[PDB]
């Protein structure tokens, strides 16, 4: 029963829209258990300077209870049905979802609706979470990788909204008002911008009837039905070096502006990132690993790890790589890294893309390893790509990619481009933007 076929067999993802704008979608499996959630098209990018951190503060309350069912009432009801509720909030995408028995499919939707709509926002709890978020910041600040990507955005998108952290400023957390969290919810958590997605043993029809029932938003004026278009974020070849010779290792991330969800090149970009891949000191492969960079990394003890990435966004994106190294091998590593990038633009081989494509498909499949991940793909696809994109399609697109294509596309986005750099730790060895800028050409 060849791969090809198993692909065209996976049940189609159904989507139906309500009069309020809400879009309900789902992929039905025989699974006795399931996952359902609302993927809102909101994040820190929608926040401005005065409320940076709202969507995150709000994330901390969508679970402390609603108007109808207060704290214990909510938790008790949810804990007692063996369900798992949890979510997240990115720069331009927020999500809240539950993992429950396909049986409870309809009661969950009710619960979801009650959260996005009737958050209690108990002004008593607010002051508590305020101290919690402040505490999580102290912690997240010790996560070099995070510090490094935030900074990456901080300078690559300096001057724009995309250059803000999701968690927000220490001041905003200390001062946001119930009212602020209030309007945040009112302004963003809106039907035409939300997506009720589900995966598992669930009837799409049953799913949508339940949606109609509690997700009964009303829309009178045109304004309400409209989805705002965010102001464009300006990428800037720049660098931010936060140095502290006291930290054990050093983090380095370099990137170029990426196209954005909609753009087909992304496929090619992924196939490329698939060649250089990623590495880490516990990869059994060793000196024989296929990725030259990885291989080089191993042969020269160049880094405790490295990883490529193609972080997409609506209108923009970040295509780069990140590596952790010892103070004294930062240069050799950076050198080799740009080396492979230049190689991508100038000499990618068919054999490489062949391996890359296979590896990619495999990752593509792992993206749908369970109701939750599958669900996450739906919520995001609709939200980002507008519709759903089947593995059969992705797989198609991927197959079209070839060396020539990789080189052209990579040259297009990499060659002779002013990159964005972020470095943290004992970064004295790696140095000079110029020296790095010249690494952008010839290979």
């Amino acid at each position: 029963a060849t791969y090809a076929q198993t692909l065209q067999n996976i049940p189609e993802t159904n989507v139906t829209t309500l009069d309020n704008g809400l879009r309900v979608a789902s992929e039905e499996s025989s699974q006795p258990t399931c996952t359902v959630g609302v993927w809102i098209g909101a994040g820190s990018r929608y926040e401005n300077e005065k409320n940076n951190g709202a969507g995150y503060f709000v994330e901390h309350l969508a679970f402390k209870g609603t108007k109808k069912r207060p704290c214990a009432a909510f938790e008790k009801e949810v804990e007692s049905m063996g369900a798992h509720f949890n979510g997240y909030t990115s720069r331009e995408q927020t999500a809240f979802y539950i993992k429950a028995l396909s049986k409870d499919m309809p009661k969950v939707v009710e619960l979801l609706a009650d959260v996005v709509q009737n958050c209690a926002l108990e002004e008593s709890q607010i002051e508590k979470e305020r101290g919690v978020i402040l505490q999580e910041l102290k912690e997240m600040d010790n996560d070099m990788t995070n510090v490094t990507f935030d900074y990456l955005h901080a300078t690559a998108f300096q001057g724009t909204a995309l250059a803000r952290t999701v968690e927000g400023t220490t001041e905003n957390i200390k001062h946001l008002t119930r009212a602020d969290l209030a309007s945040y919810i009112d302004t963003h958590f809106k039907a035409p911008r939300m997506v009720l997605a589900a995966a598992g043993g669930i009837s799409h029809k049953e799913l949508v009837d339940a949606a109609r029932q509690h997700f009964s938003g009303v829309s009178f004026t045109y304004k309400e039905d409209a989805v705002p278009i965010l102001p464009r974020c300006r990428f800037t070849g720049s660098e931010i070096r936060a140095r502290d010779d006291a930290l054990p290792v050093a983090h380095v991330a370099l990137a170029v502006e990426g196209p954005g969800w909609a753009d087909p090149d992304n496929v090619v970009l992924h196939v490329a990132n698939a060649i250089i891949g990623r590495y880490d000191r516990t990869f059994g492969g060793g000196k024989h690993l296929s990725s030259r960079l990885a291989a080089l990394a191993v042969e020269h003890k160049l880094c405790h790890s490295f990883q490529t990435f193609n972080t997409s966004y609506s209108d923009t994106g970040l295509f780069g790589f990140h590596f952790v190294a010892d103070p004294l091998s930062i240069d050799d590593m950076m050198f080799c890294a740009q080396g492979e990038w230049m190689r991508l633009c100038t000499s990618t081989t068919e054999s490489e893309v062949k391996r890359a494509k296979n590896h990619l498909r495999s990752a593509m499949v792992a993206q749908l390893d369970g109701t939750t991940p599958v669900c996450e793909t739906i919520g995001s696809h609709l939200l980002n790509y507008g519709r759903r994109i089947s593995l059969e399609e992705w797989d198609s697109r991927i197959s079209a990619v070839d060396a020539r294509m990789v080189r052209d596309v990579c040259s297009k986005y990499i060659y002779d481009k002013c990159p964005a750099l972020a470095a943290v730790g004992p970064i004295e060895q790696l140095l000079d933007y110029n020296r790095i800028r010249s690494g952008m050409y010839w290979i």
């Binding site: 070849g237 936060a242 010779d245 006291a246 103070p327 004294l328 990159p419 004295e428």
Partner: protein
């Protein structure tokens, strides 16, 4: 051999820079450049100029004086026959 990496121990210093292509090679030529050229000139002219101005004079004097001593003194032949 390799010096970059040993040099010194530094902590808590962030720096921000932009690609040469995002900025101007010679910017604020008036609002900033020249104003400082003047600033600098101003602050050093009273340290430099003096000794030179001085030597300058010493030149003129010594030159003129040497030359003066060339000319003849009429009083040397006013008794002559």
């Amino acid at each position: 051999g390799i010096h970059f990496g040993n040099l010194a121990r530094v902590r808590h210093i962030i720096t921000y820079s932009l690609s040469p292509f995002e900025q101007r090679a010679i910017p604020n030529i008036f609002s900033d450049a020249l104003p400082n050229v003047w600033r600098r000139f101003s602050s050093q002219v009273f340290k430099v100029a003096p000794p030179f101005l001085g030597a300058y004079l010493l030149y003129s004097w010594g030159t003129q004086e040497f030359e003066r001593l060339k000319r003849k003194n009429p009083a040397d032949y006013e008794n002559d026959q």
